[PDB]
Design a protein around this motif. Structure first.
Motif, PDB file in Angstrom:
ATOM      1  N   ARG A 156       1.813   0.004   2.209  1.00  0.00           N
ATOM      2  CA  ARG A 156       2.749   0.097   1.061  1.00  0.00           C
ATOM      3  C   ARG A 156       3.821   1.146   1.366  1.00  0.00           C
ATOM      4  O   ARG A 156       4.976   0.946   0.942  1.00  0.00           O
ATOM      5  CB  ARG A 156       1.984   0.423  -0.224  1.00  0.00           C
ATOM      6  N   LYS A 157       3.446   2.213   2.081  1.00  0.00           N
ATOM      7  CA  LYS A 157       4.360   3.300   2.520  1.00  0.00           C
ATOM      8  C   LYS A 157       4.452   3.281   4.052  1.00  0.00           C
ATOM      9  O   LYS A 157       3.393   3.265   4.707  1.00  0.00           O
ATOM     10  CB  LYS A 157       3.871   4.630   1.942  1.00  0.00           C
TER      11      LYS A 157
ATOM     12  N   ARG B 135      10.060   1.300   0.096  1.00  0.00           N
ATOM     13  CA  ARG B 135       9.931   1.654  -1.342  1.00  0.00           C
ATOM     14  C   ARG B 135       8.592   1.146  -1.888  1.00  0.00           C
ATOM     15  O   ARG B 135       7.995   0.231  -1.286  1.00  0.00           O
ATOM     16  CB  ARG B 135      11.123   1.121  -2.143  1.00  0.00           C
ATOM     17  N   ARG B 136       8.177   1.721  -3.018  1.00  0.00           N
ATOM     18  CA  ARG B 136       6.851   1.541  -3.669  1.00  0.00           C
ATOM     19  C   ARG B 136       6.744   0.140  -4.287  1.00  0.00           C
ATOM     20  O   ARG B 136       5.638  -0.433  -4.240  1.00  0.00           O
ATOM     21  CB  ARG B 136       6.687   2.638  -4.728  1.00  0.00           C
ATOM     22  N   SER B 137       7.846  -0.388  -4.834  1.00  0.00           N
ATOM     23  CA  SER B 137       7.860  -1.511  -5.811  1.00  0.00           C
ATOM     24  C   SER B 137       7.797  -2.875  -5.104  1.00  0.00           C
ATOM     25  O   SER B 137       6.670  -3.349  -4.863  1.00  0.00           O
ATOM     26  CB  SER B 137       9.044  -1.394  -6.746  1.00  0.00           C
ATOM     27  N   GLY B 138       8.943  -3.496  -4.804  1.00  0.00           N
ATOM     28  CA  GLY B 138       9.017  -4.898  -4.344  1.00  0.00           C
ATOM     29  C   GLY B 138       8.571  -5.037  -2.900  1.00  0.00           C
ATOM     30  O   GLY B 138       9.415  -4.827  -2.009  1.00  0.00           O
ATOM     31  N   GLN B 139       7.296  -5.374  -2.677  1.00  0.00           N
ATOM     32  CA  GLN B 139       6.659  -5.426  -1.330  1.00  0.00           C
ATOM     33  C   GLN B 139       6.436  -6.868  -0.862  1.00  0.00           C
ATOM     34  O   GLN B 139       6.151  -7.051   0.338  1.00  0.00           O
ATOM     35  CB  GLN B 139       5.346  -4.650  -1.343  1.00  0.00           C
TER      36      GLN B 139
ATOM     37  N   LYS C 128       9.131  -8.521  -1.309  1.00  0.00           N
ATOM     38  CA  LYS C 128      10.617  -8.631  -1.379  1.00  0.00           C
ATOM     39  C   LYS C 128      11.253  -7.965  -0.159  1.00  0.00           C
ATOM     40  O   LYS C 128      11.818  -6.880  -0.275  1.00  0.00           O
ATOM     41  CB  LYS C 128      11.129  -8.018  -2.687  1.00  0.00           C
TER      42      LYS C 128
ATOM     43  N   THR D  72      14.957  -5.993   0.034  1.00  0.00           N
ATOM     44  CA  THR D  72      15.154  -4.760  -0.777  1.00  0.00           C
ATOM     45  C   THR D  72      14.023  -3.743  -0.551  1.00  0.00           C
ATOM     46  O   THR D  72      14.128  -2.638  -1.122  1.00  0.00           O
ATOM     47  CB  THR D  72      15.280  -5.116  -2.263  1.00  0.00           C
ATOM     48  N   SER D  73      13.005  -4.071   0.255  1.00  0.00           N
ATOM     49  CA  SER D  73      11.763  -3.265   0.406  1.00  0.00           C
ATOM     50  C   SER D  73      12.010  -2.025   1.272  1.00  0.00           C
ATOM     51  O   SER D  73      11.300  -1.026   1.060  1.00  0.00           O
ATOM     52  CB  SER D  73      10.629  -4.088   0.961  1.00  0.00           C
TER      53      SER D  73
ATOM     54  N   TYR E 192       5.214  11.304   1.214  1.00  0.00           N
ATOM     55  CA  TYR E 192       5.390   9.890   1.622  1.00  0.00           C
ATOM     56  C   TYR E 192       4.733   9.698   2.990  1.00  0.00           C
ATOM     57  O   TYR E 192       5.352  10.062   4.003  1.00  0.00           O
ATOM     58  CB  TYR E 192       6.865   9.485   1.615  1.00  0.00           C
TER      59      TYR E 192
END
Lengths: 225, 109, 4, 128, 216, 62, 124, 34
Positions: free
Chosen positions: G45-46, G65-69, G71, G74-75, G101
RNA sequence: CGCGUCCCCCGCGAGCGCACGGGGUCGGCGGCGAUGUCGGCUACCCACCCGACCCGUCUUGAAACACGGACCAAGGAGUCUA
RNA sequence: GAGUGGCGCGGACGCUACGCCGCGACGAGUAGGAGGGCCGCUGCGGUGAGCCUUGAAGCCUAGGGCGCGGGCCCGGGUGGAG
């Protein structure tokens, strides 16, 4: 706020330090008491022998309690009854040595392998150099070298054998816990005798090296150790 | 001016009868004919000096043809002033019965 | 405490 | 000004000779490529004195110096510039080696990049 | 506050002190000796002021570094080693330098230096050997000793004085230092007859002469 | 020369499952950890059983 | 999760390259470039990437990034650092430790960044 | 740990006995002079 | 080897430093170096010492006065189904 | 073990967990069995933004090497299409 943790963790560190010193003093004083015992044991055997001679009688000293059996013949062409006894004595390799306590059950196991072993009645100094130089403890079924006392205190301490000297005392002066302290020792991997053997095949009495060498095993321990 | 080395013969290898160990050589140092006399020569440096076709560099000089295999007298062989020596290269059997120079350079006197 |  | 490895220990080898096959000297039909003799009477198989040696596991090289070149690096074989960036972090341990069937013009790219990335090449002057 | 006393137990053998820790407790008098219980330097700048960093964090890390190794104990540097002499190499003794350009020469020993190397002056007049070092192992000590005990060997000619600085040309210092020592020994080697001729002559192994046989 | 028989010196039990299924092989990683780290002998028996063959872990009826 | 899709990728990925008794991963966000659970740059994820710039000069640091994985477009959030060596290495140390991080890639990222900065420096 | 004490005592006893031996030999030399 | 307290015989002191102490270090050096020299263990040739009979095979036992093999290339023998 | 009471923004390495590390003992081998091969051959599905007329395969090689070995990778020559 940690000031109590810092102080408490240093007290624990210190409590184990004073506890070491107390064990370190016991181990020191046990050995000092053993020096006093070996004097008295050695001196009484002279004392008893003398007063017997003064009277015009004889002092027959005690038949010895403790033998040091060395295997002198190899692994090839050995009878099944001899094979079995040699591996019950933990002599599975040539010039392996074990301490064996003498009784009726042991002496008939040492005449059954007479050609294949050379044994005697080891000295105090023979038990020292064997336990110090060649002394490996059987700890978790592993041959681990007796480099600290706490190897001997962790296996044998429940029998109150808490240092090198306690082991030597338990072997030489065949104590109540001789079995456990002796089985703790790995069979001594001794080198070939320096200056040579006389004759491997024949018995010691007929100019060989096999069989019982009463005082005279100590001449060959110092040669092989 | 004079000779600063003692006359040793490379008699042969440390051997059994049907096995030879080339790593150890057996020197015969001239004069010493007992284990008594060979106490002096233990730990002494010893050279197999020979000469080949090609000019090899010489330390403290210009390139000569003469070469060395540097050894060390290790201990007394046998009963009669023979001595074991161990060289940085196992000596060639070319040199059996030829001169090697046991030096007094690792002195103890 | 003896060595205090 | 050659690239130095991180550590350069002593590559000790228990044997430097090849284990040549039994009777590869006598016949041309027999290659030098080792085959274990499984003949019933074979001198080599049953270890007679002064015969050809048989490769055991005992001759196994020290794991710390195994596959290690005389320069102290190990080979990694490289076909293009995209397989160099593999080594830009295993730089002092592993050296690049350009494959035989890589072209003359493409070596000129790899060798030149490997110099930028401080990667040692075993065959840098191999076409030109 | 206290000047250090030198250890009260004399050394009986290496490691073992002569007095037990009860006798030593007494000797130290611990019966009345009982006791109870940086980085950033702000430099002003001509803004406001700056807080400069002493030992700033590095600008380059390599792709891999080697791990810190375990700690041994008995492995001192050469500066801190103990220096042996033989019973034979005492000041005044005539040596036979075996290995050098001065090989086989009979040479007078002065003093053990602070590198274990011998200081040796087989007088430049006789041997053509200067104020020079030799190694003990590369020297035969002869049982022929002059009385050197009265001489004044200079302090300044030490290990750092004979160390090769990198053509070699003889400094006028080294010629003065030679002669100042050469002039003190030469009248003492002439006090013994036929000795200067011995120092001029060179040691050889002639036929039948076996180094083990000749005790000397 | 030591008189040992090497016939039985190799113990013929499972160190790991023969299967290549990942979900079991993640449960083994979880119980590799728990077995040796926890003092519980339960986790030792579960780990030991995750190795065993289809036939050695037969179906238990409701 | 990461531990699952490691057990798929560990041996049979396109980025995996075995030869000369060595194993490597040519993944676009692996810093030590080696086939490893920790260093794999697709699976967590990180993820910290460190590549040279679109120009010749500087380092790009790729934070995932944490969110759209699910995606991919934009990831990954890329930031070019074109500074002196000591401050380029400092920024990366701050990004990783003081955002927490993936803080066990803190030193691999620096050693990589250091070796990229060395690379784009003129030869003697 | 007691080995150090035993060794120190042994060395000291050996030294004292050697001094006594030297004294006895001196007495013997005096007797030979008489 | 403080003593506050217990009766028969009459719970953390601070420093430093040396080391026979949990596997080697030197905060020691010295030579040499462009057309003759250095290194290169392996590989090419040669020499010497030691060892060393020819493989496959059947066999209790093969260097055998047992058999097959002059040499080389390519082909060439536990398969598939039930 | 826990709760109520009497300045400076720093810290090697790792953990293809089918990996990495530690400690002990041990190592003949026919017939035979088993295991592991990042041993090798040929084809197929995937895959390497692989390699290749700026020279593929094959072959030769007193070249440089790697692996205990099966083998392999590099250099140089030849060759011409994989």
């Amino acid at each position: 706020n940690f000031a109590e943790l810092k102080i408490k963790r240093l007290r624990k560190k210190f409590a184990q330090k004073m506890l070491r010193k107390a064990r370190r003093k016991l181990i020191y004083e046990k050995a000092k008491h053993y020096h006093k015992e070996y004097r008295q044991m050695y001196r009484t055997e002279i004392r008893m022998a003398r007063m017997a001679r003064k009277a015009g009688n004889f002092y027959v000293p005690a038949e010895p309690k403790l033998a040091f059996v060395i295997r002198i013949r190899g692994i090839n062409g050995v009878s099944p009854k001899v094979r079995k006894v040699l591996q019950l004595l933990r002599l599975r390799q040539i010039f392996n040595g074990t301490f064996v306590k003498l009784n009726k059950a042991s002496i008939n196991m040492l005449r059954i392998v007479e050609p294949y072993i050379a044994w005697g009645y080891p000295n105090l100094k023979s038990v020292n150099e064997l336990i110090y130089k060649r002394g490996y403890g059987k700890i978790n079924k592993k041959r681990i070298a007796l480099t600290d006392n706490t190897l001997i205190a962790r296996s044998l301490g429940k029998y109150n054998i808490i240092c090198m000297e306690d082991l030597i005392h338990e072997i030489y002066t065949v104590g109540k816990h001789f079995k456990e302290a002796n089985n703790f020792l790995w069979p001594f991997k001794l080198s070939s005798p320096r200056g040579g053997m006389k004759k491997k095949t024949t018995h010691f009495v007929e100019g060989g090296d096999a069989g019982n060498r009463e005082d005279q095993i100590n001449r060959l321990i110092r040669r092989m150790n | 001016s004079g000779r600063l080395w003692c006359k040793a013969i490379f008699a042969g290898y440390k051997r059994g009868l049907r096995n030879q160990r080339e790593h150890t050589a057996l020197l015969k140092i001239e004069g010493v004919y007992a284990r008594d006399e060979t106490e002096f020569y233990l730990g002494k440096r010893c050279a197999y000096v020979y000469k080949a076709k090609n000019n090899t560099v010489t330390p403290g000089g210009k390139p000569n043809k003469t070469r060395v295999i540097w050894g060390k007298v290790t201990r007394a062989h046998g009963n009669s002033g023979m001595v074991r020596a161990k060289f940085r290269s196992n000596l060639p059997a070319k040199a059996i019965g030829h001169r090697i120079r046991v030096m007094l350079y690792p002195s103890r006197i | 405490r003896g060595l205090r | 000004a050659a690239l130095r490895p991180l550590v350069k220990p002593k590559i000790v080898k228990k044997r430097t000779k090849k284990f040549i096959r039994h009777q590869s000297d006598r016949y041309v039909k027999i290659k030098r490529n080792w085959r274990k003799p499984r003949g019933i009477d074979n001198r080599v198989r049953r270890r007679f004195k002064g015969q050809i040696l048989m490769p055991n596991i005992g001759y196994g090289s020290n794991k710390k110096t195994k596959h290690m070149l005389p320069s102290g690096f190990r080979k990694f074989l490289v076909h293009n510039v995209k397989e160099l960036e593999v080594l830009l972090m295993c730089n002092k341990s592993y050296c690049a080696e350009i494959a035989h069937n890589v072209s003359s013009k493409n070596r000129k790219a790899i060798v030149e990049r490997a110099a930028q990335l401080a990667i040692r090449v075993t065959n840098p002057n191999a076409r030109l | 506050k206290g000047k250090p006393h030198c250890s009260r137990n004399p050394v009986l053998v290496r490691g073992i002190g002569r007095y037990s820790r009860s006798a030593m407790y007494s000797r130290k008098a611990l019966y009345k000796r009982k006791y109870a219980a940086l980085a950033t330097v702000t430099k002003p700048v001509g803004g406001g002021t700056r807080v400069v960093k002493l030992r700033k964090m590095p600008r380059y890390y390599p792709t891999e570094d080697v791990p810190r190794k375990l700690l041994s104990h008995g492995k001192k540097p050469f500066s801190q080693h103990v220096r042996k002499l033989r019973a034979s190499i005492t000041p005044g003794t005539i040596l036979i330098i075996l290995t050098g350009r001065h090989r086989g020469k009979r040479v007078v020993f002065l003093k053990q230096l602070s590198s274990g190397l011998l200081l040796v002056t087989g007088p430049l007049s006789l041997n053509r050997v200067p104020l020079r070092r030799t190694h003990q192992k590369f020297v035969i000590a002869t049982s022929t000793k002059i009385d050197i005990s009265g001489v004044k060997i200079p302090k300044h000619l030490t290990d750092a004085y004979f160390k090769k600085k990198k053509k070699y040309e003889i400094t006028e210092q080294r010629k003065v230092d030679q002669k100042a020592v050469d002039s003190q020994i030469l009248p003492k080697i002439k006090a013994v007859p036929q000795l200067q001729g011995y120092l001029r002559s060179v040691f050889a192994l002639t036929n039948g002469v076996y180094p083990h046989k000749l005790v000397f | 020369g030591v008189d040992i028989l090497h016939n039985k010196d190799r113990k013929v039990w499972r160190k790991e499952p023969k299967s290549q299924d990942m979900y079991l092989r993640l449960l083994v990683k979880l119980y590799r950890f728990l077995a040796r780290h926890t003092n519980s002998t339960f986790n030792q028996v579960v780990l030991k059983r995750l190795f065993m063959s289809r036939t050695k872990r037969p179906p238990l009826s409701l | 999760s990461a531990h699952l899709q490691w057990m798929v990728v560990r041996n049979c990925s396109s980025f995996l390259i075995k030869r000369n008794k060595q194993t490597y991963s040519t993944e676009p966000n692996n810093l030590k470039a080696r086939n490893s659970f920790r260093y794999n740059g697709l699976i967590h994820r990180k993820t910290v990437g460190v590549e040279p710039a679109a120009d010749g000069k500087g380092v790009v640091v790729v934070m995932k990034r944490r969110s759209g994985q699910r995606k991919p477009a934009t990831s990954y959030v890329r930031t070019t650092i074109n500074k002196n060596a000591r401050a380029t290495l400092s920024s990366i140390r701050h990004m990783i430790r003081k955002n927490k991080y993936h803080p066990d890639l803190r030193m691999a990222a620096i050693r990589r960044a250091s070796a990229i900065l060395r690379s784009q420096k003129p030869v003697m | 740990p007691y080995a150090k004490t035993m060794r120190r005592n042994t060395i000291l006893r050996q030294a004292r006995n050697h001094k006594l031996r030297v004294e006895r030999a001196a007495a013997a030399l005096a007797a030979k002079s008489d």
